[PDB]
Amino acid sequence: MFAWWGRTVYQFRYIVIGVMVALCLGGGVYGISLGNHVTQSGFYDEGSQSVAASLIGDEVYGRDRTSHVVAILTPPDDKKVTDKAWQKKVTEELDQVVKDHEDQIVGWVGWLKAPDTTDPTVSAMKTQDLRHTFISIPLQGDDDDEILKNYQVVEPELQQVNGGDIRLAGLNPLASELTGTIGEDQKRAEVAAIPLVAVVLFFVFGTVIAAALPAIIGGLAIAGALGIMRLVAEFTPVHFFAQPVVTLIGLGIAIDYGLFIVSRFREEIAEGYDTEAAVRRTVMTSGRTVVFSAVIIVASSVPLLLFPQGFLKSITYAIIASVMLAAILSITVLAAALAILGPRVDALGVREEVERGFWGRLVNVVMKRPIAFAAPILVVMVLLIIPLGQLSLGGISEKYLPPDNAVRQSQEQFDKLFPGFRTEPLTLVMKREDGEPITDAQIADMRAKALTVSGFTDPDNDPEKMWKERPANDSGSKDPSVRVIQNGLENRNDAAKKIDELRALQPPHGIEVFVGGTPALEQDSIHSLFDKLPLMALILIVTTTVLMFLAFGSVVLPIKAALMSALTLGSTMGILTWMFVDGHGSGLMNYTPQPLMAPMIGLIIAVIWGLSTDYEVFLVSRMVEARERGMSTAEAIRIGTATTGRLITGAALILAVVAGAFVFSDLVMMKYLAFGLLIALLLDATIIRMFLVPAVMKLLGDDCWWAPRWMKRVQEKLGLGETELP
């Protein structure tokens, strides 16, 4: 197989170098148009019942724009707010803002337009102290992103009201700073880590071209990845955290892939055959190695397709495109580029034997007492997977930002004087058939059915006042064919129980019950994730194990690899749990202990499983190819793992630098992911490969291979069994 590829690839070097760059610069420049298009809202499971209830309710009554952006006004000099002067000034400023930006807002409404009101809806919104009062601004928008952009437009003067000492609250400021933190963090990463990423791999090489090549190809790969998944975005909206994660994954993985091939080609040109033969056997081995690692990681990541959450789909598409394009980038153009480079690789300039001796003696002292080198780490790793039991999960909120932040502080201050204007109630949608008003008793009978259960919010202290109709906006389409009511579950820890009891309620004659609302919206997501988790885990195990069995003929290695990766996964996620849901360190790292998001764990399990498995197979490719040189396993272990230690450690440190750069973020979730990758890589690099692979490898003796031939022949006739060089 791959001999044909080498024999045809040294033929075309200049042509390939031209065409690949000429066709990928299109995506490189096309990524800006991706930078234009952004979506933010999709986090909930699209196919559940709460989303359908919300959709039909939004159809019947429209959307309520009272909670988009909220400003807290405080008067200078501590003056009675009921005066005329300061109120006149603020109304002047606000109606000037209203007229100046017509399309963004509808206007302003609240207490401050009511001099002497009677109804305790806006007079009671004024604090008894009369030193803070909030007045809301509804925003005209077609959908979510249009509203967010309109609020971004109206930022300057709407924040520059009076002296500028009024604070802004609501969902829109939170979303705006959430999406601004992503850009700030991306700028910080691309300014800080990239120099370190380049110089670390430069020092281990002391070379110009050999150090520049991994970055040169990683940038092209990520540019193509954004181009491809933007082309996808025409058929499916892509979320905005797809911007930093594509960097976070692709940079490291593409640099790793290029680094392996560069190292092999250089170590083979320097010692063995000439340029062409060395590069063709270099592709012979490393091209299939990196291709197998890429197919393993895509097979491990595609199980995320099960979850219907949109941003998960976007992340999966971006990462699979990134890695499968980096694979073909590394195998195709790199071989020809190095072949035409020839002696120019290390000629640019600015230990070998001592380093190989240190590695060999470390391996031998592992062989001194391999079981004593594995039992303590085996015990401590389960000791580290213990703390996952106190795990708790929840949705996104305003506490996902550092407490020192201005918008978070303002939102927290909003509830200091306004107790119950920020409510998240549970909704009961109706299901009417005829389309004209059938009966007026249905609201009463559903009220009684809800009354069959106790433990709910009865602030009015009236048996009937509970469960009132939703405030219907005039712009909505009032179809008398579906009815919505609302009220709030008090303690959101009993939200699951209340939702279960309410969904179990009687659906009346011709009436079908629905349960919407933000608690149900954020609970159906976690329920769907926990229901689709088992098949996700089953495929993540089986597909990866079988696929990595096809790389090399042995069948024992997949078995050991499966539980070597799964236990590392458990250990790193347990360390993350003990660190975050308990906030151990927050005090110093400026975040808050809070439950993690539902989809983040589902993403992280798959991604770290893929990373651990691919790093392990990168290490063990030499381990398995060394034996069929006519040697036994005792020499093969050292032969495989001696020269590999120089390069994988540098690559691991590169990904560690990228993750550490992402650690300095503001959002808690990117901190979660970055620490997860740091801990998983640090474990699998420092301790796992260094005292666990040989520890079980020698203990398994020469039995390590024991490959049945009835499947070994199938392994052979795929053409990819060429693990021996002539």
Residue numbers in the entry: 1 to 350, 382 to 757
Give verbatim excerpts from the published study on this entry:
We then determined the cryo-EM structure of MmpL3 surrounded by GDN detergent micelles at a nominal resolution of 2.94 Å (MmpL3-GDN). The structures of MmpL3-GDN and MmpL3-ND largely resemble each other. However, there are conformational differences between the two. Superimposition of these 2 structures gives rise to an RMSD of 1.4 Å (for 710 Cα atoms), suggesting that these conformations are distinct from each other. The calculated volume of the periplasmic central cavity of GDN solubilized MmpL3 using CASTp 3.0 is 1,716 Å3, which is similar, albeit smaller, to that of the protein embedded in nanodiscs. A detailed inspection on these 2 structures suggests that there is a relative rotational motion involved between the periplasmic subdomains PD1 and PD2 of the MmpL3 membrane protein, where PD2 is found to rotate by 6° in relation to PD1 of MmpL3-GDN when compared with the structure of MmpL3-ND. However, the structures of MmpL3-GDN and MmpL3-TMM II represent the fully open channel conformations.
The mycobacterial membrane protein large 3 (MmpL3) transporter is essential and required for shuttling the lipid trehalose monomycolate (TMM), a precursor of mycolic acid (MA)-containing trehalose dimycolate (TDM) and mycolyl arabinogalactan peptidoglycan (mAGP), in Mycobacterium species, including Mycobacterium tuberculosis and Mycobacterium smegmatis. A detailed analysis suggested that MmpL3 is a TMM flippase that is absolutely essential for transporting TMMs across the cell membrane. Our structural data are in line with MD simulations that indicate the major conformational change of the transporter is located at the periplasmic subdomain PD2, where this movement can easily be interpreted as a rigid body rotational motion of PD2 in relation to the PD1 subdomain.
